[PDB]
Design an enzyme around this catalytic site. Structure first.
Site, PDB file in Angstrom:
ATOM      1  N   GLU A 168       0.801  -1.192   0.000  1.00  0.00           N
ATOM      2  CA  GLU A 168       0.000   0.000   0.000  1.00  0.00           C
ATOM      3  C   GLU A 168       0.842   1.253   0.000  1.00  0.00           C
ATOM      4  O   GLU A 168       0.357   2.235  -0.406  1.00  0.00           O
ATOM      5  CB  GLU A 168      -0.996   0.034   1.189  1.00  0.00           C
ATOM      6  CG  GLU A 168      -2.038  -1.022   1.174  1.00  0.00           C
ATOM      7  CD  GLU A 168      -3.101  -0.808   0.074  1.00  0.00           C
ATOM      8  OE1 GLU A 168      -3.130   0.238  -0.594  1.00  0.00           O
ATOM      9  OE2 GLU A 168      -3.928  -1.700  -0.120  1.00  0.00           O
ATOM     10  N   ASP A 197      -6.301   6.823  -5.177  1.00  0.00           N
ATOM     11  CA  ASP A 197      -5.762   5.473  -5.208  1.00  0.00           C
ATOM     12  C   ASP A 197      -5.773   5.023  -6.663  1.00  0.00           C
ATOM     13  O   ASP A 197      -6.015   5.855  -7.525  1.00  0.00           O
ATOM     14  CB  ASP A 197      -6.486   4.516  -4.243  1.00  0.00           C
ATOM     15  CG  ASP A 197      -7.906   4.147  -4.695  1.00  0.00           C
ATOM     16  OD1 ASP A 197      -8.426   4.626  -5.713  1.00  0.00           O
ATOM     17  OD2 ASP A 197      -8.525   3.321  -4.008  1.00  0.00           O
ATOM     18  N   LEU A 250      -8.940   4.172   2.575  1.00  0.00           N
ATOM     19  CA  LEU A 250      -9.918   4.753   1.695  1.00  0.00           C
ATOM     20  C   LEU A 250     -10.810   5.777   2.420  1.00  0.00           C
ATOM     21  O   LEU A 250     -11.411   5.467   3.423  1.00  0.00           O
ATOM     22  CB  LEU A 250     -10.769   3.598   1.095  1.00  0.00           C
ATOM     23  CG  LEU A 250     -12.040   4.140   0.391  1.00  0.00           C
ATOM     24  CD1 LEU A 250     -11.600   4.927  -0.887  1.00  0.00           C
ATOM     25  CD2 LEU A 250     -13.048   3.046   0.049  1.00  0.00           C
ATOM     26  N   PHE A 300      -8.751  -6.413   2.993  1.00  0.00           N
ATOM     27  CA  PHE A 300      -8.296  -5.064   3.176  1.00  0.00           C
ATOM     28  C   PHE A 300      -8.425  -4.256   1.869  1.00  0.00           C
ATOM     29  O   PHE A 300      -8.866  -3.142   1.907  1.00  0.00           O
ATOM     30  CB  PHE A 300      -6.845  -5.093   3.657  1.00  0.00           C
ATOM     31  CG  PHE A 300      -6.309  -3.760   4.039  1.00  0.00           C
ATOM     32  CD1 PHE A 300      -5.854  -2.876   3.069  1.00  0.00           C
ATOM     33  CD2 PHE A 300      -6.231  -3.384   5.389  1.00  0.00           C
ATOM     34  CE1 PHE A 300      -5.336  -1.637   3.442  1.00  0.00           C
ATOM     35  CE2 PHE A 300      -5.735  -2.144   5.743  1.00  0.00           C
ATOM     36  CZ  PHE A 300      -5.284  -1.270   4.767  1.00  0.00           C
ATOM     37  N   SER A 347     -12.598 -19.703  -6.256  1.00  0.00           N
ATOM     38  CA  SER A 347     -11.246 -19.652  -5.667  1.00  0.00           C
ATOM     39  C   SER A 347     -11.297 -20.048  -4.195  1.00  0.00           C
ATOM     40  O   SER A 347     -10.466 -20.799  -3.729  1.00  0.00           O
ATOM     41  CB  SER A 347     -10.679 -18.228  -5.706  1.00  0.00           C
ATOM     42  OG  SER A 347     -10.609 -17.754  -7.020  1.00  0.00           O
ATOM     43  N   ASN A 364      -7.317 -19.596 -10.993  1.00  0.00           N
ATOM     44  CA  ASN A 364      -8.661 -19.014 -10.934  1.00  0.00           C
ATOM     45  C   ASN A 364      -8.646 -17.555 -10.376  1.00  0.00           C
ATOM     46  O   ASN A 364      -9.355 -16.690 -10.877  1.00  0.00           O
ATOM     47  CB  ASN A 364      -9.591 -19.923 -10.124  1.00  0.00           C
ATOM     48  CG  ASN A 364     -11.028 -19.495 -10.200  1.00  0.00           C
ATOM     49  OD1 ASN A 364     -11.522 -18.751  -9.365  1.00  0.00           O
ATOM     50  ND2 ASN A 364     -11.713 -19.941 -11.243  1.00  0.00           N
TER      51      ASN A 364
END
Ligand SMILES: [Cl-]
Ligand SMILES: [Cl-]
Length: 162
Positions: A11, A20, A32, A104, A117, A132
């Site tokens: 990040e 972002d 965010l 996250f 998945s 996948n």
């Protein structure tokens, strides 16, 4: 290596409001603020997140406090989610960090949409989950970060981060 160090690498850290990869106002370590195109709406979410009049700038301590809360909230989001929890409980500790990283990034609703998945992760079919997971907007938009997380699910080691 641990979830905190993993997410700090993926990040980054910025002390001033920024946009972002999607164009959303964000601050700190991937916190965010709002999806709204209004910079004033972002600053106002920022003052409220921090408890003071920031003017769009925060310190390192405050960035780290937001981070701590967000990691905590991602964990708790996983444990309260009927789809995610059984998957998380089945995984070893390294691969648990990869699940938290995804949540996250894309929220619990996001990850809970990776139904196929999830099932392959639960069954510990690692190579097939990696294939996948890659068939996704997430991988096509942020391939470098997505590959790091996929490799972690695939191998159960921190190699992609070392
Ligand atoms: Cl907050
Ligand atoms: Cl990326």
């Amino acid at each position: 290596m641990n979830i905190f160090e993993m997410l700090r690498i993926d990040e980054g850290l910025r002390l001033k409001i920024y946009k972002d990869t999607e164009g959303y106002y964000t601050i700190g370590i991937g916190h965010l603020l709002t999806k709204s195109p209004s910079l004033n709406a972002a600053k106002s979410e920022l003052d409220k997140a921090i408890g003071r009049n920031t003017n769009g700038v925060i310190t390192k301590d405050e960035a780290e406090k937001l981070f701590n809360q967000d990691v905590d909230a991602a964990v708790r989001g996983i444990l309260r989610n009927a789809k995610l929890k059984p998957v998380y409980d089945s995984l070893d500790a390294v691969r648990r960090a990869a699940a938290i990283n995804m949540v996250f990034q894309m929220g619990e609703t996001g990850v809970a949409g990776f139904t196929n998945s999830l099932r392959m992760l639960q069954q510990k079919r690692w190579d097939e989950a990696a294939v996948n997971l890659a068939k996704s907007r997430w991988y096509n938009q942020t391939p470098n970060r997505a590959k790091r997380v996929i490799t972690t699910f695939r191998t159960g080691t921190w190699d992609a981060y070392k």
